[PDB]
Design a protein around this ligand. Structure first.
Ligand SMILES: [K+]
Ligand SMILES: [Mg+2]
Ligand SMILES: [Mg+2]
Ligand SMILES: [Mg+2]
Ligand SMILES: [Mg+2]
Ligand SMILES: [Mg+2]
Ligand SMILES: [Mg+2]
Ligand SMILES: [Mg+2]
Ligand SMILES: [Mg+2]
Ligand SMILES: [Mg+2]
Ligand SMILES: [Mg+2]
Ligand SMILES: [Mg+2]
Ligand SMILES: [Mg+2]
Ligand SMILES: [Mg+2]
Ligand SMILES: [Mg+2]
Ligand SMILES: [Mg+2]
Ligand SMILES: [Mg+2]
Ligand SMILES: [Mg+2]
Ligand SMILES: [Mg+2]
Ligand SMILES: [Mg+2]
Ligand SMILES: [Mg+2]
Ligand SMILES: [Mg+2]
Ligand SMILES: [Mg+2]
Ligand SMILES: [Mg+2]
Ligand SMILES: [Mg+2]
Ligand SMILES: [Mg+2]
Ligand SMILES: [Mg+2]
Ligand SMILES: [Mg+2]
Ligand SMILES: [Mg+2]
Ligand SMILES: [Mg+2]
Ligand SMILES: [Mg+2]
Ligand SMILES: [Mg+2]
Ligand SMILES: [Mg+2]
Ligand SMILES: [Mg+2]
Ligand SMILES: [Mg+2]
Ligand SMILES: [Mg+2]
Ligand SMILES: [Mg+2]
Ligand SMILES: [Mg+2]
Ligand SMILES: [Mg+2]
Ligand SMILES: [Mg+2]
Ligand SMILES: [Mg+2]
Lengths: 58, 159, 183, 185, 172
RNA sequence: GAAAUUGUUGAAAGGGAAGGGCAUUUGAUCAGA
RNA sequence: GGAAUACUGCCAGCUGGGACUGAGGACUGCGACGUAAGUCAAGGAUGCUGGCAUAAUGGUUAUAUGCCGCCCGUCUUGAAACACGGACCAAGGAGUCUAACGUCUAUGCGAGUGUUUGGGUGUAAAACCCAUACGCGUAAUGAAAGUGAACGUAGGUUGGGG
RNA sequence: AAAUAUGUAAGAAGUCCUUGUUACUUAAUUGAACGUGGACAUUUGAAUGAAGAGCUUUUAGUGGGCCAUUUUUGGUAAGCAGAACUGGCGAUGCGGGAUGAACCGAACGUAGAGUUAAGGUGCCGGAAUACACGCUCAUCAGACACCACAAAAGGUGUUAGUUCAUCUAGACAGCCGGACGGUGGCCAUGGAAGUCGGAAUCCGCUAAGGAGUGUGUAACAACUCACCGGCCGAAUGAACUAGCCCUGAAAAUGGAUGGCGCUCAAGCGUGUUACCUAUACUCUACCGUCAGGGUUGAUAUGAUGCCCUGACGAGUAGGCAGG
RNA sequence: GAGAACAGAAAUCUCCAGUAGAACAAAAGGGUAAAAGCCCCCUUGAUUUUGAUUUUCAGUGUGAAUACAAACCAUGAAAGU
RNA sequence: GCAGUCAAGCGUUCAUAGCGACAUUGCUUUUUGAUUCUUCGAUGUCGGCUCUUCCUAUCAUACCGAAGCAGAAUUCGGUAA
RNA sequence: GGUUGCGGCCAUAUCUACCAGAAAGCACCGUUUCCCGUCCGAUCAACUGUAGUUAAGCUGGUAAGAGCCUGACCGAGUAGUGUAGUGGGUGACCAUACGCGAAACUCAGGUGCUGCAAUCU
């Protein structure tokens, strides 16, 4: 016996019951897909900046 | 059977903007995109590489990565009942700087300048935008503008 | 204002009165079968119950909201007498998320004195003349829970526009009569 | 009828009393309820809230953790407050002299503190000494180091410790865990 | 829509820097209140000129009372109305003491004889016929004869009580 | 020594079901002060 | 030309009749009137009077009257259904225990924890006491051979209760 | 090239200034990214709201749907079959639509009072046989959306309109007179003269007459009308338009504006009031729930207690809690 | 379209116009003119390592695709690809 | 299946006595389909016999109108089950 | 202001038909040993800047020019459309209320602007 094929009925109500939540923007986002050459240089840049800041404590 | 390909239902979406076909002008390549820039996505049909999916046509996102000929764009795509972070690798032909934020940066500059000039002149800020207010009172003169009386016209066909 | 109108008429001009800066909106439709966008606008205007009313400062941003919820509300331009009676009889403040009757000027001062509002007439003034702290004063005022109109609605059917012989929409000056009968 | 903008009759979702039937814990809760009501001390309020917490929400605080908190600059003479159990830690060899207020002390932790020359005191003694939580330092143990936590959020590309009884080769390591058998996760 | 009042409504087509002081268009609207009067003004202005309420403003609205509300006049009324199948222009004649009474009679008569609702009727013009023999409708002409007299046969008096003891009479 | 079911007695009602809800009239019966 | 009146609106103008309610239970407050004493319609009813003192009010029950009221259970989009089970009543009658587990909670002890396989003992299947092991935890990773967790104040930055 | 719908932004994770790191990058401290330090807090950079916000774990049932407005596909169509957005029914009582899952109104703790919604106010039946202007007479009248049907085409029925005409220099109708000559006009036909048929669409007399409006003849002849007159004396004619009513309009047990019945309605169109009544709205009381608080300063034994304040209460499957 | 022996409608040669009305393996849609089409030259980037991303999506798999990184190469004068 | 509207034509002449093309509006549920709403813990599945009642879209009988109705016969139609 | 090299936007720049252009520049132009490439020194390459010319390219102008561009209370608040009603209508569809709002059409105007560098009567 044939039945219903598809409907989006009630789907927006279900989604809005717990709401459509914006995805929690952060500071310092992930560097996952960032250019690996840039990431390799940025690691050393952060190392040097931390070293300089620590040495500045005299 | 059904058909849902990568470029399905893109027939008019990926057209070449009638009488603007052919080579992409050089300003598109001369634009410079930095991480944190806000860009609108509009696919160029003549550039098949680095092309965005049809879903991201007209979406505005943030550049998170910069490569030789492409940028990485962050889009918040609504999936079910929440937004998922999507990272698109788009050649510069399919993106442009969003003017929804250059105007905002100009407004920020103007606000800072106005705050400086106000702290120099006196005590007033009024730095927030306000909606269109109801109109103040006005006096309308009839000098040379005697009100002309109109009436509804009778029906006629003129066919 | 009266003398300005007379002076314009004597000078052969027309005095165009300033557009109204304040409206009173009353929800005249029940809470069933409301489309999501007008329902959200009603919630944001705090009209979550039939015969609930609030003051709205008129701008483009709120005029569009009233446009969206036109078929479910009767709104108009409240007079000073209407505002005074509304605040005196059905005036409640939102204090610690509670509906506290405005039976004393100290109640108003404790919550709105930081805005220079010290009394019930201070609050009424801030509402009628849409002052700098109209938003805070109006939000302090709990939504007015009016009764059904005492002499009826004056129309056989409420849910066409006031212009079309119904009850909803802008009824600009007759909102005073409607709200007084509802008060 | 009212178009409700939020769920009606929603409980606050926070404990207002200890689930425990410990009479002494209830007495401590009464004392700190009085204190939080009539002292306006945020320390007293947070201690009253912590007195309700379940066991997994009061992870043990080790003496080494307390020693690091005292190594914090300017905190060497503060009364360390742990609403829960203080456990011993032999991985540290130099423990400082300090006063630690806690719900419970293990035998080793109490011995270590007393031998280093401090004192182990109860929360009511802490309340008597510092009714406003004067010069206190509240320490909390690691909640998300629990064994149950690592299995939370399990799914593809999550790296979240599958729930398993036997570990080793032949136990959930072949298909869906490496490219050589179908795919990796 | 109700007992009618006549309003003059003057609107502006709100001024700009290029065009200050626009042409101040006026109409005479029959409406039961000022809100309906302004709505009808904007309806007809949208029918006539390139303007809408959002791009214009009501300069003035004034109730026009009958100059001689206790003088019996004959009015020629030119209307345009929508029937079930088309639009038609009609001329009618109404005897009354005021324009508002004549317009109420016009709306009642159009509803009664053509099932034309208020929304389907445009009042093209209302004008007093100053001279007799310019009245061209017989149903008004017959009331313009000299020394007009007529009885009221079969007078039906309303009883206040359920029962009567008299077998009443319809004399008048 | 229950119920179904039944006899007698007593009470009451009964124009093509009966039973029920709200409310009170009437009859019977009863607690509290 | 001078008014009036209608209509609409306003008064912190006055006043008559009717109905429902009387919550609370020392004081505290805001006020009003008074020069002040005090008084008050001001953070919720008191005063005066009558009858009865029991079936009178009330409850229960039967009946009468006005209006309303389809047969429950079930499957179902939809049951009063011309869908199914049910003539009636009594008694019986259906998420149990176990092995191994996830979450959460309580308890004990805590880098350890688990006395009860067993031994000792006993007022004898109880209670009480206990050695060596073993299990799990304190190390992971790799197919495996194997290797095996501090540059640092056990790091830096942002937020973070106290 | 809309409308609706839709992405982003409207700041302190910001802006500006100076200069630190790097193995990246640059011709190059050039830039890139991350920073030290400094300056900017009344509107920290639109509106409105916010029984708070964020987060985590774990589990139930469900995974046959259906209906209404709108968009919409297949189909002649369907109470058909399939999509879109929303609102609903399922899961839901209540007032109204007589009756009904879905429509209108309104969502529900126990009560009192008031006011209403939708719908109604002749009687059933609570509430005006109310007011007012018109329309309709049906020998199948009509009488409230969903909804329980009716069409094309018609009607000097009746009503109201549009446009064009005739008319006291006599309109139309009515009675009577004339209605010729050229001319049997020409032609097709056996015969056709105005009149079975084609073309030509003329004039003299003319107030007026058509090479013809009909009847009649085998063809004639003859009556007849357009056309003009005699008499009467003021309004009349034609084509249209759309209201109500009527024809079109035929099914089976006897029966349905709900019934009765109703005809200047108790029908239809419209307008103004008054009135009736929902579990809705307003106020109050009481029950419970939730939330925010007060109170170990004692006799005072119920701090899980006592108390204050505010809001809320529908519910199948299902979950939990207190009994 | 205009011309040239055989040669005509169609062998080939020449000029003019020609926004693509052609072609790009295939279905359709899009795209492309000093090219993505045609011809010629050189080639193997149809390579190696393992990650990230997009569509389908449970944000699993598979397929397909995108942008890099680390190499080794091809081509070009080179930018580049 | 039945019934209309228009009227090019048929009917010697004459569209409508009787018909009526090309079109178009309907009605009916005695056809057959379409659907799958009810019934699969069961509504006895063809036809005939028997018997009652109902409908009218009337074959006959009653009374009529029209005709290309002289009579006779017949045809069309009305009220009528 | 002209012109050249490189350009940005990519017709207000394009297209058709005519006319004009001082100076410089550009260009056509002259030659074939070499590099180079062709059936063909036509293109491409090299050489001269000399033998000549503004004829063409190019630039600008003209045209009730084609196109294109801009604006409009031009059409038109029309078409369409969001929302509303126990509105109309047998229906098809339509009207009204609160909003948004085209395209064609018509009219008028316009016909490249401009960046860096160099050069010029
Ligand atoms: K069956
Ligand atoms: Mg299904
Ligand atoms: Mg496009
Ligand atoms: Mg490719
Ligand atoms: Mg009343
Ligand atoms: Mg009503
Ligand atoms: Mg409620
Ligand atoms: Mg016995
Ligand atoms: Mg018995
Ligand atoms: Mg009997
Ligand atoms: Mg008055
Ligand atoms: Mg009391
Ligand atoms: Mg009694
Ligand atoms: Mg009943
Ligand atoms: Mg079924
Ligand atoms: Mg059932
Ligand atoms: Mg049945
Ligand atoms: Mg069964
Ligand atoms: Mg049975
Ligand atoms: Mg039993
Ligand atoms: Mg199932
Ligand atoms: Mg189906
Ligand atoms: Mg179900
Ligand atoms: Mg419902
Ligand atoms: Mg009905
Ligand atoms: Mg109630
Ligand atoms: Mg009655
Ligand atoms: Mg008709
Ligand atoms: Mg009635
Ligand atoms: Mg009526
Ligand atoms: Mg509490
Ligand atoms: Mg409930
Ligand atoms: Mg090429
Ligand atoms: Mg059977
Ligand atoms: Mg049977
Ligand atoms: Mg018949
Ligand atoms: Mg040459
Ligand atoms: Mg060359
Ligand atoms: Mg030249
Ligand atoms: Mg031109
Ligand atoms: Mg509605």
């Amino acid at each position: 016996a044939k039945s219903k094929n598809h409907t989006a009925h009630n789907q927006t109500r279900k989604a809005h019951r717990n709401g459509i939540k914006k995805p929690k923007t952060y500071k310092y986002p992930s560097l996952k897909g960032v250019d690996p050459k840039f990431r390799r240089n940025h690691k050393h840049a952060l190392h040097g900046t931390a070293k300089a800041l620590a040495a500045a404590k005299k | 059977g059904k058909s849902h390909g990568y470029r399905s239902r893109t027939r008019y979406m990926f057209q070449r903007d009638f009488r603007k076909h052919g080579a992409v002008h050089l300003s598109t390549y001369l634009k410079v995109y930095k991480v944190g820039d806000i860009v609108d996505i509009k696919a160029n049909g003549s550039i098949q590489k680095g092309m965005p999916h049809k879903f991201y046509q007209g979406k505005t996102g943030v550049v998170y990565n910069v490569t030789k000929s492409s940028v990485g764009v962050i889009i918040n795509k609504m999936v079910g009942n929440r937004y998922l972070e999507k990272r698109l690798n788009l050649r510069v032909e399919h993106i442009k700087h969003s003017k929804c934020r250059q105007e905002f940066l100009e407004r920020v500059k103007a606000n800072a300048a106005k705050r400086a000039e106000a702290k120099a002149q006196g005590v007033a800020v009024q730095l927030k935008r306000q909606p269109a207010q109801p109109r103040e009172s006005r006096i309308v003169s009839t000098e040379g503008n005697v009100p002309q009386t109109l009436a509804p016209v009778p029906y006629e066909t003129f066919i | 204002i009266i003398q300005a109108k007379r002076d314009a008429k004597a000078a052969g001009s027309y005095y165009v009165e300033a557009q109204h800066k304040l409206v009173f909106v009353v929800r005249i439709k029940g809470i069933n079968k409301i489309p999501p966008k007008p329902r959200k606008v009603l919630q944001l205007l705090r009209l979550t119950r039939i015969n609930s009313g609030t003051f709205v400062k008129v701008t483009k941003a709120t005029l569009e909201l009233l446009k969206l919820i036109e078929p479910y509300v009767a709104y108009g331009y409240p007079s000073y007498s209407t505002i005074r009676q509304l605040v005196y009889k059905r005036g409640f403040g939102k204090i610690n998320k509670q509906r506290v009757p405005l039976s004393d000027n100290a109640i108003i001062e404790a919550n709105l004195g930081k805005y220079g509002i010290l009394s019930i007439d201070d609050l009424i003034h801030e509402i009628i003349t849409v002052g700098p702290h109209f938003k805070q004063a109006n939000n302090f005022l709990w939504p007015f829970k009016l009764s059904n109109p005492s002499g009826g609605w004056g129309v056989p059917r409420k849910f066409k526009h006031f212009i079309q012989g119904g009850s909803f929409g802008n009824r600009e000056e007759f909102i005073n009569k409607l709200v007084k009968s509802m008060n | 009828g009212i178009d409700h903008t939020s769920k009606q009759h929603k409980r606050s979702g926070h404990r207002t009393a200890p689930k425990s039937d410990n009479v002494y814990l209830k007495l401590l809760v009464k004392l700190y309820t009085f204190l939080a009501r009539r002292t306006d001390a945020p320390f007293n309020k947070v201690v009253l809230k912590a007195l309700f917490l379940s066991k997994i929400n009061r992870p043990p605080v080790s003496v080494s953790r307390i020693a690091r908190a005292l190594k914090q600059e300017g905190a060497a003479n503060k009364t360390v407050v742990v609403v829960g159990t203080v456990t011993d830690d032999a991985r540290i060899f130099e423990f400082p002299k300090t006063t630690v207020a806690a719900l419970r002390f293990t035998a080793g932790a109490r011995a270590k503190i007393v031998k280093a020359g401090g004192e182990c005191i109860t929360l009511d003694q802490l309340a008597v000494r510092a009714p406003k939580g004067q010069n206190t330092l509240i320490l909390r143990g690691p909640r998300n180091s629990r064994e149950a936590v690592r299995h939370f959020g399990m799914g593809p590309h999550k790296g979240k410790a599958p729930r398993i009884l036997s570990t080793g080769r032949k136990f959930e390591r072949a298909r869906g865990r490496r490219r050589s058998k179908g795919f990796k996760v | 829509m109700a007992h009618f009042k006549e309003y003059q409504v003057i609107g502006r087509r709100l001024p700009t820097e290029s065009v200050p002081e626009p042409k101040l268009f006026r109409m005479r609207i029959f409406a039961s209140n000022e809100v309906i009067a302004k709505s009808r003004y904007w309806y007809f202005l949208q029918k006539l000129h390139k303007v809408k309420k959002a791009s214009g403003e009501i300069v003035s609205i004034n109730q026009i009372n009958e100059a001689h509300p206790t003088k019996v006049k004959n009015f020629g009324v030119w209307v345009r109305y929508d029937s079930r199948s088309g639009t038609h222009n009609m001329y009618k004649e109404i005897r009354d003491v005021s324009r508002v009474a004549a317009v109420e009679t016009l709306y009642q008569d159009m509803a009664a004889r053509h099932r034309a609702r208020f929304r389907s009727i445009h009042i093209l013009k209302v004008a007093e016929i100053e001279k007799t023999a310019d009245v061209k409708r017989q149903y008004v002409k017959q009331f313009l004869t000299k020394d007009l007299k007529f009885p009221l046969p079969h007078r039906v008096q309303k009883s206040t009580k359920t029962f009567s003891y008299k077998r009443p009479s319809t004399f008048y």
